[PDB]
Amino acid sequence: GLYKVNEYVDARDTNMGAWFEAQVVRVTRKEEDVIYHVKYDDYPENGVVQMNSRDVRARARTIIKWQDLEVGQVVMLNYNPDNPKERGFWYDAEISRKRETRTARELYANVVLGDDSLNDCRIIFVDEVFKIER
Ligand SMILES: Cn1c2c(c(=N)c3c1CCC3)CCC2
Ligand SMILES: Cn1c2c(c(=N)c3c1CCC3)CCC2
């Protein structure tokens, strides 16, 4: 179907909701009837994982500049639920709040963990928010 053997993709671990860089190694039937089998780029040793089509995307690397961020946008961004001031994983999220002074910028989003959602997370890496194609 939509993504091809050997295509570089992002794949979402449906347990934890985070997206990781991966490669399609095999495509089988069960687009909603397609199963992607992927390997994560720096972990050949961890084998192949089966993904539903909704948990695979082309690698979208279009940054949305600070000024263009808007409340209500569903975007891809970096968050760490266990240490919220630190670098974490990549998640889908809906921008919920945006605040700026001359010296400070704050961004809040409702982060999707697949299982639950996490409203108004404070997002630290406001200059690495990415667009979702869709
Ligand atoms: C947006 N992004 C994503 C992933 C990355 N490793 C990197 C970016 C940006 C740099 C590395 C995984 C899923 C989305
Ligand atoms: C670090 N990591 C983690 C998970 C992954 N699926 C992948 C990585 C790296 C690529 C795939 C689940 C929890 C942590």
Determine if ligand 1 sits within 6 Å of the CB of residue 18. Answer: no
**What distance in Å separates the CA atoms of residue 95 and residue 132, rounded to the nearest whole number?**
13
Domain boundaries, the chain: 1-61, 62-134
CATH fold of the domain at 1-61? SH3 type barrels. (2.30.30)
Q: What is the whole-number distance in angstroms between the Cα of residue 21 and the centre of ligand 1? A: 7
Distant-in-sequence, close-in-space partners of 49: CB < 8 Å, separation ≥ 6: 11, 13, 37, 38, 39, 40
**What distance in Å separates the CA atoms of residue 132 and residue 73, rounded to the nearest whole number?**
10
**Closest to 90 (Cα-Cα) out of 120, 55, 66:** 55
CATH class of segment(s) 62-134: mainly beta
Note whether 86 and 42 are within 8 A (CB). no
b (16+ CB within 10 A) / e for 56-92: bbeeeeeebeeeebeeebebbbbbebeeeeeebbbbb
Q: What is the whole-number distance in angstroms between the Cα of residue 81 and the centre of ligand 1? A: 17
Please measure the distance between the N-terminal and C-terminal CA atoms of the chain and give it in whole angstroms: 17
**What distance in Å separates the CA atoms of residue 85 and residue 125, rounded to the nearest whole number?**
9
Residue 115 has, within 13 A of its CA and on its CB side, a CA count of 4
| Cross-strand partners of 94 | 74, 110
Q: Let me know if the fold of 1-61 is the same as that of 62-134.
A: yes
